CSV table of C-alpha atoms and ligand atoms in Angstrom, one decimal:
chain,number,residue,atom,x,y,z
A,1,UNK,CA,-7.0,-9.7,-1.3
A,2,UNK,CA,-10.2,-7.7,0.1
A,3,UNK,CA,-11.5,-4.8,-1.8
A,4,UNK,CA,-11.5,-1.3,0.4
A,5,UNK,CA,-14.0,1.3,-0.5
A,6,UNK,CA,-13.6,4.7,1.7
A,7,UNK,CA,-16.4,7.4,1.4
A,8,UNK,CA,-17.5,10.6,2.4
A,9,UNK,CA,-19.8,10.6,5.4
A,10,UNK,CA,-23.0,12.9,4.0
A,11,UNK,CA,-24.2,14.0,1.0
A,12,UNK,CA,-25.1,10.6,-0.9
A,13,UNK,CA,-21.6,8.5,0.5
A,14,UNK,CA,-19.3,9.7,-2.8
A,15,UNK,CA,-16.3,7.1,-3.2
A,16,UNK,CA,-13.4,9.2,-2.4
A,17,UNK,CA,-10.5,6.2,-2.2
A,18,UNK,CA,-10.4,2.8,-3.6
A,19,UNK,CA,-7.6,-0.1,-3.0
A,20,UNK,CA,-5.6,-2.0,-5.1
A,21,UNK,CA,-8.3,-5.3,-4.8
A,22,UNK,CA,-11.3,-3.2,-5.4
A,23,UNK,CA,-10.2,-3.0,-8.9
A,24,UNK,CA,-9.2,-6.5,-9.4
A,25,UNK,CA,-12.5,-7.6,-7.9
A,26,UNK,CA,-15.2,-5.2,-9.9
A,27,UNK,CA,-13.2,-4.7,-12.6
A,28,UNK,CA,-13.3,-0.3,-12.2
A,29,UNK,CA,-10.6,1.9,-12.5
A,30,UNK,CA,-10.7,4.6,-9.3
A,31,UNK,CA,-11.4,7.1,-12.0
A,32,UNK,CA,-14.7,5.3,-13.1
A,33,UNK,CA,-15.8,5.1,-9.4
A,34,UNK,CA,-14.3,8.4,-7.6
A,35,UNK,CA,-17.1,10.7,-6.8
A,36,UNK,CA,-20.1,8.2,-7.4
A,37,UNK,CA,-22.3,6.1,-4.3
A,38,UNK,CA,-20.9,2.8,-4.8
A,39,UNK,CA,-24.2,1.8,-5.9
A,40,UNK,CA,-23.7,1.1,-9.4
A,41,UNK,CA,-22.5,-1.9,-8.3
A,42,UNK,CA,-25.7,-3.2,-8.2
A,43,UNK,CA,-27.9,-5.0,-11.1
A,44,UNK,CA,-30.8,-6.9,-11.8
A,45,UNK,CA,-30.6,-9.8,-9.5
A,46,UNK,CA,-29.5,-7.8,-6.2
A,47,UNK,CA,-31.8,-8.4,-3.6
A,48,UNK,CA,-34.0,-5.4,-2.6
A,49,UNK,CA,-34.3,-6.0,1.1
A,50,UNK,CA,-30.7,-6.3,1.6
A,51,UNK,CA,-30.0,-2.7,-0.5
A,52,UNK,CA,-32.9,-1.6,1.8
A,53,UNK,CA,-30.8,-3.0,5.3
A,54,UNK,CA,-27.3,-1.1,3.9
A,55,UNK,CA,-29.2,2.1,3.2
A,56,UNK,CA,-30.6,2.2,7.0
A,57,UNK,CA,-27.1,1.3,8.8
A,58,UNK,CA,-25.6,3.8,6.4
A,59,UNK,CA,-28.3,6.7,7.7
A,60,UNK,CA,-28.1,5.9,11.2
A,61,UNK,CA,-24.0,5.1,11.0
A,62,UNK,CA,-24.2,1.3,12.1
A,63,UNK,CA,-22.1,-1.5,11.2
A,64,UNK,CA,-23.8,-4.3,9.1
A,65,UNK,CA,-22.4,-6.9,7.3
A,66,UNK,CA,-24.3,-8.3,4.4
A,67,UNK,CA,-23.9,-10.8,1.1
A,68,UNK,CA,-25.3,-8.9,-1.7
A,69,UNK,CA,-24.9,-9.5,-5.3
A,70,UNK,CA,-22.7,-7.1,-7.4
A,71,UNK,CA,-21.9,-6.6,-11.1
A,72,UNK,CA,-18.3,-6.0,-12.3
A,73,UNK,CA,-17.5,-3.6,-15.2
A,74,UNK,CA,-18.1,-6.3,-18.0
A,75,UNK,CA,-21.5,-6.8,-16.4
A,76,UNK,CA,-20.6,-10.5,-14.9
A,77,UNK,CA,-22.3,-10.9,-11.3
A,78,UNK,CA,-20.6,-11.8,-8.5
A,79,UNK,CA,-21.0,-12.0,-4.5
A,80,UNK,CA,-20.0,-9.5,-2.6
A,81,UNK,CA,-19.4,-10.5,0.9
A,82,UNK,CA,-19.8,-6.6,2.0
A,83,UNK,CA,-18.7,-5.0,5.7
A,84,UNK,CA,-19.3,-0.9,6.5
A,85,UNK,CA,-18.4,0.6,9.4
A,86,UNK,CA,-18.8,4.4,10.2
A,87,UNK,CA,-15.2,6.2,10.6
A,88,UNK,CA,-15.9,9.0,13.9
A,89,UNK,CA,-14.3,11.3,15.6
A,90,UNK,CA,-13.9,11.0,19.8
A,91,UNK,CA,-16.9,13.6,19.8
A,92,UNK,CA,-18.8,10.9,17.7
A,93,UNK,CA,-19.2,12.8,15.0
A,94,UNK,CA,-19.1,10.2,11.5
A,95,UNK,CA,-15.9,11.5,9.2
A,96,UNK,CA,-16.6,9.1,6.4
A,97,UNK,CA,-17.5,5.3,5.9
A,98,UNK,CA,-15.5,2.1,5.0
A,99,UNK,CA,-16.3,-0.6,2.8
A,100,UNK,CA,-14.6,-4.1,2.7
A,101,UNK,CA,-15.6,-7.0,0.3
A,102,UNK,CA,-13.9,-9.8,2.2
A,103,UNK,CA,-11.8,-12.1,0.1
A,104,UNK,CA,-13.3,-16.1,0.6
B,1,UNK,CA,-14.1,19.1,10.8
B,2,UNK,CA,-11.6,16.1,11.8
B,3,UNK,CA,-8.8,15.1,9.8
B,4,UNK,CA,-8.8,11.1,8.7
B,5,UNK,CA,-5.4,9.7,7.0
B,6,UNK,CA,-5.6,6.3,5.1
B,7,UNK,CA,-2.9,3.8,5.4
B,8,UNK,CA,-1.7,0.6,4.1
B,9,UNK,CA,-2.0,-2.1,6.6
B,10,UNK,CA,2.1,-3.5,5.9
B,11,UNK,CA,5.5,-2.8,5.8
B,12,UNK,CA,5.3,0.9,7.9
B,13,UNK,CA,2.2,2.2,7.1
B,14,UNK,CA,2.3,4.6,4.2
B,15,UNK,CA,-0.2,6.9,3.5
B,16,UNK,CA,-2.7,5.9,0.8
B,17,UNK,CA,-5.4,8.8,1.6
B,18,UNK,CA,-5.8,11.8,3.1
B,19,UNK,CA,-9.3,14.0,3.8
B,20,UNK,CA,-9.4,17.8,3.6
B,21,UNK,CA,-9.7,18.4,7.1
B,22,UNK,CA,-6.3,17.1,7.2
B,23,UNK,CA,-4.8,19.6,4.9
B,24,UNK,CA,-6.4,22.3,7.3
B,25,UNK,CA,-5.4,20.9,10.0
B,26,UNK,CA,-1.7,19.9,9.4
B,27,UNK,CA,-1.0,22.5,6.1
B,28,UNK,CA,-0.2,19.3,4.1
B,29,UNK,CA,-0.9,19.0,0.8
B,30,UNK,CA,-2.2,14.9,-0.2
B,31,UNK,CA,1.0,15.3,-2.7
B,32,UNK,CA,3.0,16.4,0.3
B,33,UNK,CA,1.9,13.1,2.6
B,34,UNK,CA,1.3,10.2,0.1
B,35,UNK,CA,3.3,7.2,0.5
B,36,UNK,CA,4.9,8.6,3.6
B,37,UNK,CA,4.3,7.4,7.4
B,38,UNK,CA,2.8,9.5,9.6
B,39,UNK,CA,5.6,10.2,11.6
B,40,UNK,CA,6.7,12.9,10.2
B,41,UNK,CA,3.9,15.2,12.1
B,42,UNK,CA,6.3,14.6,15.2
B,43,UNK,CA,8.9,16.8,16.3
B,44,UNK,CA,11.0,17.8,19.2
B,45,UNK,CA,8.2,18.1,22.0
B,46,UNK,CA,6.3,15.3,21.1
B,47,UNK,CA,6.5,12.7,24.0
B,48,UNK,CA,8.7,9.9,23.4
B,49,UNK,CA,6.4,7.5,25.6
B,50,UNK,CA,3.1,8.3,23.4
B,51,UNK,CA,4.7,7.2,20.6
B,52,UNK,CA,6.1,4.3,21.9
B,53,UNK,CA,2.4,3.2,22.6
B,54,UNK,CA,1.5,4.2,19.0
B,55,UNK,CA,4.1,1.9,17.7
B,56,UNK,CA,3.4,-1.4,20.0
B,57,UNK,CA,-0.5,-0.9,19.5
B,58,UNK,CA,-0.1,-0.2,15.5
B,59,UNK,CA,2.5,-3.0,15.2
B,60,UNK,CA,-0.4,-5.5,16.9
B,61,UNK,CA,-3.5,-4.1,14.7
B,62,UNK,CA,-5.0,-2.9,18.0
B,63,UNK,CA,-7.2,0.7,18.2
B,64,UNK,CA,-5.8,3.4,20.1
B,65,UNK,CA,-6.4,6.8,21.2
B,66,UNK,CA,-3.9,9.4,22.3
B,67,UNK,CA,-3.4,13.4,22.4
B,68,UNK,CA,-0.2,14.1,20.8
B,69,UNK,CA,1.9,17.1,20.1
B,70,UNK,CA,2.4,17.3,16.3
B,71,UNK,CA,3.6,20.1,13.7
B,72,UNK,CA,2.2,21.6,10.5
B,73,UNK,CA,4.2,21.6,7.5
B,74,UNK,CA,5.9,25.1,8.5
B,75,UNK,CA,6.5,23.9,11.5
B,76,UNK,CA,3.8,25.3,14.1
B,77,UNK,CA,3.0,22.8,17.0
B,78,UNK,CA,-0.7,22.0,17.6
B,79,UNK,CA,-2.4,19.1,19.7
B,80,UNK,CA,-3.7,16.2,17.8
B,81,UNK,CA,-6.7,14.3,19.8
B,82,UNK,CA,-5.4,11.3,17.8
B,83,UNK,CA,-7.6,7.8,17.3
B,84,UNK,CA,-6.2,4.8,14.8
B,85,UNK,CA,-8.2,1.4,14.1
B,86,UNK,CA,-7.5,-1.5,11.9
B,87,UNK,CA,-9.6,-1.9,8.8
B,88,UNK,CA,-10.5,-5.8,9.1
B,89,UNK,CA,-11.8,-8.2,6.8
B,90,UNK,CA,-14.5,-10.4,7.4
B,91,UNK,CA,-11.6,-13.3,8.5
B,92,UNK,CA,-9.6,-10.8,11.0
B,93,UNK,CA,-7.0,-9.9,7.9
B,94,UNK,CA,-6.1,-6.3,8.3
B,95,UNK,CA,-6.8,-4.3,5.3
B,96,UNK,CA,-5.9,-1.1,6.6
B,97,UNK,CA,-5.5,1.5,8.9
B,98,UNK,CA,-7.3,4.6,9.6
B,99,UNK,CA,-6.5,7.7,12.0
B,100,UNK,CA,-8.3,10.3,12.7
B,101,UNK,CA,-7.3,13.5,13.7
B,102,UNK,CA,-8.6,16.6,15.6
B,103,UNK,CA,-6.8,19.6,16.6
B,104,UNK,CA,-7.6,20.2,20.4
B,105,UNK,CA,-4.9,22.9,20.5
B,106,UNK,CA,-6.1,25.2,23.7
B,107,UNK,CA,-4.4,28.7,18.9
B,108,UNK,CA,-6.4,32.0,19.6
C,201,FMN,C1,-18.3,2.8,2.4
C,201,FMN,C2,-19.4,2.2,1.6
C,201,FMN,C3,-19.1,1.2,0.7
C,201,FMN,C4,-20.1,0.5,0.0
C,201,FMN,N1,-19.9,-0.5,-0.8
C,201,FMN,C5,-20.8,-1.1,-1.5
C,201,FMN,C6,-20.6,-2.2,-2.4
C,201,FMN,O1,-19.4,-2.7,-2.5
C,201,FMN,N2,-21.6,-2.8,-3.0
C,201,FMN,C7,-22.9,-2.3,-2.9
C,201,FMN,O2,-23.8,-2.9,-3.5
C,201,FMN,N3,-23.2,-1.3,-2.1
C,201,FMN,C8,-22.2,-0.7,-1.4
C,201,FMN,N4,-22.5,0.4,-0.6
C,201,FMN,C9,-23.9,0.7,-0.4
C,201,FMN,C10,-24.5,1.7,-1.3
C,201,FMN,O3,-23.6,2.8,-1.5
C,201,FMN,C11,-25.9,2.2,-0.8
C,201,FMN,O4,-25.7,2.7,0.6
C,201,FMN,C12,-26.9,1.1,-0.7
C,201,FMN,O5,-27.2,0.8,-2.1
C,201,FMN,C13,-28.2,1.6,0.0
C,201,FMN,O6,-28.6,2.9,-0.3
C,201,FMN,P1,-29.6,3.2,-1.6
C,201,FMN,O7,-30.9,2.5,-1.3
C,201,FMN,O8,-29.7,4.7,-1.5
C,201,FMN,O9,-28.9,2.7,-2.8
C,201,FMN,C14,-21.5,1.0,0.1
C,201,FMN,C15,-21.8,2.1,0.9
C,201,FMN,C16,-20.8,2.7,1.7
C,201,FMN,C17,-21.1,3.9,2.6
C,202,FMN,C1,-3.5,5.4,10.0
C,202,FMN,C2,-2.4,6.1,10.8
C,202,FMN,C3,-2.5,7.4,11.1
C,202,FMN,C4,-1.5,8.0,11.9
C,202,FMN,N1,-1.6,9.4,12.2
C,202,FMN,C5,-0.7,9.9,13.0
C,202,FMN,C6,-0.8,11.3,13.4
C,202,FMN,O1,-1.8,12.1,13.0
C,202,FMN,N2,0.2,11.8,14.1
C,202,FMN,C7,1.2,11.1,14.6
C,202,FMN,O2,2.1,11.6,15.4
C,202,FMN,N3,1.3,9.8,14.3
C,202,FMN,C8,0.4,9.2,13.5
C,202,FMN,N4,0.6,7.9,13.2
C,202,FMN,C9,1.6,7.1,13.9
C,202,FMN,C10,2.9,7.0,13.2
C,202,FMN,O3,2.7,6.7,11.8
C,202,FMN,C11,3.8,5.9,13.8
C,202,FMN,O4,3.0,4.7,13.8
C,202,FMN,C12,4.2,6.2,15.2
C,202,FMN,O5,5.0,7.4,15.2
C,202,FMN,C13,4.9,5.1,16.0
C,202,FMN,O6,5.9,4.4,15.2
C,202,FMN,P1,7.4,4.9,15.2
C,202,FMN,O7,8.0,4.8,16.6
C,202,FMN,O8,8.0,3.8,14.3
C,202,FMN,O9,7.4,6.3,14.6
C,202,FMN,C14,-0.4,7.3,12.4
C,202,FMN,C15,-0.3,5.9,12.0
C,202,FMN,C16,-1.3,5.3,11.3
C,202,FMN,C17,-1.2,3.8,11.0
């Protein structure tokens, strides 16, 4: 199943709602994960220029899609095969953002 | 501020999530909402057709935008400017839904 992450639209993108699969897949309770930038899913190995293409869609509110290279709780890596898309209102305005790691 | 609800993408739609705004807006509670559908913001005046469209377009995973009449928990009516998407994985699998909500009500 694909992993849902929901977050707040400003001040740094806090998760505020996880799914069922986001736990299977990284291995985090929502407890560990509620209030943080998702982040600290990163490690070593994740490739700068693609953190670097996330964080401008996320400050302009774009969709991007993007393969990046995550870390579970136990600190195994895996691939992340990553989607956001801004949440707006009919005015435009961005309400919050959505994270999916597809499943396969 | 807009109110955004959370849903699970099967087996009518409960709600998994629910902002602040929404609790401003609708005088819900998250422990008052969780695991329920939506519907229960309708009420007497809210038109039968609108929701009819709601229910084909949600039933197909399709977006949709509608002004509805709904009803705060105590019962006061107030206009919902009302948009719903699917959450979709990268292989068209809906994850999700999400509404957002916005009180266009004419109250003061
Ligand atoms: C809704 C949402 C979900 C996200 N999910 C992930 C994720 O699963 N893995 C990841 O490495 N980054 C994820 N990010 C991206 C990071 O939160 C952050 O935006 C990115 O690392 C770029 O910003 P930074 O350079 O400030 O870290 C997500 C961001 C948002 C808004
Ligand atoms: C994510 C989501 C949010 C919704 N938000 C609202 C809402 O704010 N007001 C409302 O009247 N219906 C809302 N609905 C619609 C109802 O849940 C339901 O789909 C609609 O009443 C049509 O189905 P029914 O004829 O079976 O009730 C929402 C549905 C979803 C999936």
């Amino acid at each position: 199943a694909s992993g849902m992450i929901v977050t707040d639209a400003g001040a740094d993108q806090p998760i505020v709602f996880v799914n069922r699969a986001f736990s299977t897949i990284t291995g985090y309770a929502p407890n560990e994960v509620l209030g943080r930038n998702a982040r600290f899913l990163q490690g070593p190995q994740t490739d700068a220029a693609t953190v670097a293409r996330l964080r401008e869609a996320i400050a302009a509110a774009r969709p991007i899609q993007e393969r990046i290279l995550n870390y579970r709780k136990d600190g195994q890596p895996f691939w992340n095969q990553l989607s956001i898309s801004p949440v707006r209102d009919e005015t435009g305005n961005v309400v919050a953002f959505v994270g999916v790691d597809t499943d396969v």
